[PDB]
Nucleic acid binder design. Structure first.
Ligand SMILES: [Cl-]
Ligand SMILES: [Cl-]
Ligand SMILES: [Cl-]
Ligand SMILES: [Cl-]
Ligand SMILES: [Cl-]
Ligand SMILES: [K+]
Ligand SMILES: [Mg+2]
Ligand SMILES: [Mg+2]
Ligand SMILES: [Mg+2]
Ligand SMILES: [Mg+2]
Ligand SMILES: [Mg+2]
Ligand SMILES: [Mg+2]
Ligand SMILES: [Mg+2]
Ligand SMILES: [Mg+2]
Ligand code: NA
Ligand code: NA
Ligand code: NA
Ligand code: NA
Ligand code: NA
Ligand code: NA
Ligand code: NA
Ligand code: NA
Ligand code: NA
Ligand code: NA
Ligand code: NA
Lengths: 156, 29, 172, 142
RNA sequence: AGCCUGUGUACCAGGAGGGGAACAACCCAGAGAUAGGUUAAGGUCCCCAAGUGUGGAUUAAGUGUAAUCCUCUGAAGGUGGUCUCGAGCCCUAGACAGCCGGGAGGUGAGCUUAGAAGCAGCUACCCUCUAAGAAAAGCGUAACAGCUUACCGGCCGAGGUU
RNA sequence: CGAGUGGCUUGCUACCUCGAUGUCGGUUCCCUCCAUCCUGCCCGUGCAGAAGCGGGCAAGGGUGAGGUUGUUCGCCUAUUA
């Protein structure tokens, strides 16, 4: 099903698992990538910033993350960098799959609500921004237009 | 103010004592 | 902006309206140089290309007019020449100059002669498996050379195997 | 043949629409106008899109009909007609007191209206009505 | 959804007249008759009343000349199309680019391998001449040769580069 | 995984017609669209040639005959560019 159906934040927040059952598991494999043993003790820190409030299905998160981290293997399976996707798909989403009668939909998935200007991804690298490329590929699989932002890094 | 250029004008003046611009430079000394 | 081109002692360049003519011992070439707000004039010993605008599009044409004029200076004195080489693998290609067009016969065995008409005062002198296209108008000479090579173009089959044709060997 | 024009306008190198707009205004004021050298009138823009528009007008039509002129003659006159309420009595009277000519059948040289002249030295993107008609298939009778 | 169902409010319904091409609810506006005048929304090239108004800039696509909207689409992504503003670095001790010349030897390093000589793989990567020149960045060879990057010099002459 | 275009299917809605806008399929006869099947002109090829595959421009013209089925659709046969 197309993102057209769920990318907008026009519906009430729907996240109370005590009143919602049958919620599909998330497809997001990990949130901490790279050298998670080490702490952000890197020279450069780039972030992928969302430029519009939107809902991002756990579907897109996984594909976006994979496409970025799977690529960050331009540095190697045990390369020196740490990757972080800071958002989690809390918003439960429905579908009315009778016509408009008793239409309250059944749970079909989950999505994460991101407000314009928040960073969804944050990578930590030594002067070796292959990460800037890992993100050109990442904002490629999420609905919004995005800003690739570098923070600690005056090594231009 | 490149230093290597400053050192060359010296080395050149030294051999003169015992690039073209750098030679013309030393000569001017 | 304004650029000044000192015309060669060997040449005389006159210009009325948007047309410039350049005459030398080797001939004469006239061109139209028309572009928004770019004035081209002959100030005695030098040709002047000037304009009150400096935007990218304007500078582009100014630079183009320059090379066009210098190219004319060169064409009326030293002249322009392109060298070509006829080549064949099985069928003896026959390239002849007949009238104001060069004709090529027996190309890849073809019964129908392939031809093209020469541009302007361009001389196509052919000697054996060598051709020389020359004249004072680089535009004309360049095309005549090109057309000759294009004349043997093949799309139907693999060019890497069927390499017959005439090719530009030396560019001025 | 013979047209007592109170005003003879020269369209050579002028913006068709700006001339037409003035010739319209004047004919509605009771003036008899003649536009000369229509073939040399001009319209700014990219020749390719300009021609597509007029070509589309030629192709448009059906049994009821959409007679669109091909000669620079009519193109210009139709242009003026669009600036007049030609179906009203007053409009038709004005329109009928305006005539466009290929070249100049008069002795006098027409006048150039203010703000209608195009400077060829500072303009390269424009076309001649004559060129448009040639593209449309007109018979260059000028 | 020009959907369904709440809520507050103004409107249509039951609301003229002016504008919006037309058009219940969008804008101005709430209206006795008649008359003169000035504005509102909106508009002043023509159709069409009033500017082919002024100072300046951008756009070359007829983009555009489309407040609102079922109604006026145009998106993610991309753009050395073009204009403007900033920061860093290099430059008349001559920068960037191009063209010309130089790119040397110990030495075809050692190792492995019939082989390997900058360039299959492994290790190392030293010092000489010098104004330059890797134990070789890319091609090429069966391996050589050959062709070039790095690096230096010249010609040139003004900004260049990120 | 993400962004869209179309309005041929299906679903949704209940705006229009219940003082009736005659059904499906077929047929006959006319016009059109392009997201092109053939034909023209081209590009790439894992392009030797021949035969292809894929792509671009392009709607001028063509796109036919039959066996089962009311069928639309579809299956099948022999021709065909
Ligand atoms: Cl018609
Ligand atoms: Cl009318
Ligand atoms: Cl122009
Ligand atoms: Cl009231
Ligand atoms: Cl237009
Ligand atoms: K009914
Ligand atoms: Mg073939
Ligand atoms: Mg009522
Ligand atoms: Mg008026
Ligand atoms: Mg438009
Ligand atoms: Mg809008
Ligand atoms: Mg009926
Ligand atoms: Mg097409
Ligand atoms: Mg047709
Ligand atoms: Na039901
Ligand atoms: Na995106
Ligand atoms: Na115009
Ligand atoms: Na017509
Ligand atoms: Na009311
Ligand atoms: Na109205
Ligand atoms: Na338009
Ligand atoms: Na009825
Ligand atoms: Na029927
Ligand atoms: Na067709
Ligand atoms: Na059948």
């Amino acid at each position: 099903k197309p993102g057209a159906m769920y990318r907008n934040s026009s519906k009430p927040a729907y996240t109370r698992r005590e009143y919602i059952s049958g919620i599909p598991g998330k497809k997001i494999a990990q949130f901490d990538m790279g050298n998670n043993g080490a702490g952000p003790t890197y020279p450069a820190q780039v972030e992928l910033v969302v430029e519009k409030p939107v809902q991002i299905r756990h579907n897109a998160l996984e594909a976006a993350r994979v496409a970025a981290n799977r690529y960050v293997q331009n540095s190697g399976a045990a390369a020196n960098y740490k990757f972080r996707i800071r958002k989690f798909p809390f918003h439960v989403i429905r579908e009315n799959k009778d016509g408009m009668r008793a239409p309250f939909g059944k749970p079909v998935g989950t999505a994460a609500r991101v407000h314009g200007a928040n960073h969804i991804f944050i990578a930590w690298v030594n002067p070796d921004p292959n990460v800037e490329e890992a993100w050109r590929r990442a904002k490629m699989k999420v609905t919004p237009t995005i800003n690739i932002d570098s923070s600690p890094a005056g090594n231009a | 103010i490149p230093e290597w250029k400053q050192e060359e004008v010296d080395a050149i003046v030294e051999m003169i004592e015992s690039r073209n611009t750098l030679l013309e430079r030393a000569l001017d000394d | 902006p304004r650029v000044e081109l000192e015309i060669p002692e060997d040449v005389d360049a006159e210009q009325d309206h948007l047309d410039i003519t350049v005459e030398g011992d080797n001939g004469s070439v006239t061109r139209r140089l028309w572009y928004p707000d770019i004035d081209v004039s002959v100030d005695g010993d030098t040709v002047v290309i000037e304009s009150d605008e400096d935007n990218a599009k304007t500078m582009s044409t100014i630079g183009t007019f320059q090379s066009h004029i210098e190219n004319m200076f060169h064409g009326v004195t030293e002249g322009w020449e392109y060298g070509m080489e006829v080549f064949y693998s099985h069928f003896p290609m026959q390239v002849n100059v007949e009238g104001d067009e060069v004709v090529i016969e027996n190309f890849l065995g073809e019964k129908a002669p392939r031809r093209t008409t020469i541009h302007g005062d361009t001389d196509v002198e052919i000697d054996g498996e060598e051709l020389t296209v020359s004249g004072p108008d680089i535009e004309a000479v360049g095309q005549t050379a090109a057309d000759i090579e294009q004349l043997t173009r093949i799309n139907d089959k693999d060019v890497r195997v069927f390499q017959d044709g005439v090719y530009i060997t030396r560019k001025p | 043949a013979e047209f007592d024009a109170d005003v003879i306008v020269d369209a050579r190198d002028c913006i068709m629409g700006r001339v037409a707009s003035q010739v319209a205004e004047q004919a509605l004021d009771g003036e008899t106008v003649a536009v000369v050298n229509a073939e040399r009138a001009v319209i700014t823009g990219r020749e390719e899109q300009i021609v597509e528009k007029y070509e589309k007008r030629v192709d448009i039509g059906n049994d009821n009909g959409y007679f669109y002129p091909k000669r620079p003659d009519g193109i210009f006159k139709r242009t003026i007609r669009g600036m007049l309420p030609h179906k009203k009595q007053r409009g038709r009277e004005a329109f009928e007191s305006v005539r466009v000519y290929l070249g100049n059948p008069y002795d006098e040289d027409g006048e150039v209206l203010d703000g209608t002249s195009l400077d060829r030295l500072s303009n390269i993107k424009f076309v001649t009505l004559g060129e448009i008609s040639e593209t449309l298939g007109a018979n260059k009778t000028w």
